[PDB]
């Protein structure tokens, strides 16, 4: 009787959990209204169809030590996000364009930081005329969970997630899968290159091109560091058209003609720089980001292919918003213009 109570306090290990305040229990229980439950699997399906893999299910239950309207999202036990959701009220978000003001609790949306107001339902039509995006309560939690899942797509993608990706893809594409793992490339390294792509916001939707590429390079090379760059080049048209959608002008961040030279000889064995230059490199990268942001341009640093993996992991530990692309990853049929530069004069 009591013997099974002990083993189920210890059975816990949820890869993504959300603890909820008591007034947000209704939208979480199937017997009251499951409006958040339908929201959570809606966003889980889109993520499977936008990112490539199905995320671990969110298991949610109560926590009375937190305030009534506050939800906490946390990943395998460590906290990633939080915020308020008032079930009786609506969130009126302003994307800067809408005109005017509205009464109620002044706040900012939990995902992007836009100015927002919590409003009563009678004023729902008010904010819509003004141009404010009126958003329900269950949605604020779902949209914030969706945004935080995408920010942590790589970490959510563990060894067990790669195998169910293998399984799902092994049966529509059987000829590309039976010989591949563990024949060509091992499952350990197979998982680490798709995680490498997710950590740089590169989607995994096209598994065919990813596996077709591996069949040709992985037989006599299984460093996940080099296979990632090889796979990235194969996905080069999708990478281009997601940060440069359409056929407009590719305005990138560039490196100094002397810095890139000095940077190559560091890895080339002919002399690494003073540490102060490395901190100086980080400094102008921040100014290049804010510059490209002051002209309304994507935060893309277009780089020599040999320098791409280094500067990517070196500059994104501190500036995660930066995107570091290779010259081989950008398409041919695109006209380039450097708008910001790191290391100038």
Author numbering: 348 to 692
Quote the authors verbatim.
Trp-354 fits into the hydrophobic dimple, and Ala-351 hydrophobically contacts with Pro-442 on the periphery of the dimple. Ile-7 and Tyr-10 of the N-terminal α-helix of FliS is in the corresponding position of Ala-351 and Trp-354 of FlhAL, respectively. Tyr-10 fits into the hydrophobic dimple of FlhAC, and Ile-7 interacts with Pro-442 of FlhAC. When Ala-351 and Ala-356 of FlhAC-ED in the crystal structure were replaced back to the original Glu-351 and Asp-356 residues, respectively, the side chain arm of Glu-351 can form a hydrophobic contact with Pro-442, suggesting that FlhAL can bind to the hydrophobic dimple of FlhAC even in the wild type without the flhAED mutation. Because the introduced Ala residues would increase the helical propensity of residues 349–357 of FlhAL as seen in the crystal, we suggest that the flhAED mutation allowed residues 349–357 of FlhAL to efficiently form an α-helix to stabilize the binding of FlhAL to the hydrophobic dimple of FlhAC. Far-UV CD measurements revealed that the flhAED mutation did not affect the secondary structures of FlhAC. Unlike wild-type FlhAC, FlhAC-ED and FlhAC-EWD did not bind to immobilized GST-FlgN at protein concentrations less than 10 μM, indicating that FlhAL with either of these two mutations inhibits the binding of FlhAC to FlgN.
The flagellar protein export apparatus switches substrate specificity from hook-type to filament-type upon hook assembly completion, thereby initiating filament assembly at the hook tip. FlhAC (residues 328–692) consists of four domains, D1, D2, D3, and D4, and a flexible linker (FlhAL) (residues 328–361) connecting FlhAC with the N-terminal transmembrane domain of FlhA. Interactions of the flexible linker of FlhA (FlhAL) with its nearest FlhAC subunit in the FlhAC ring is required for the substrate specificity switching.
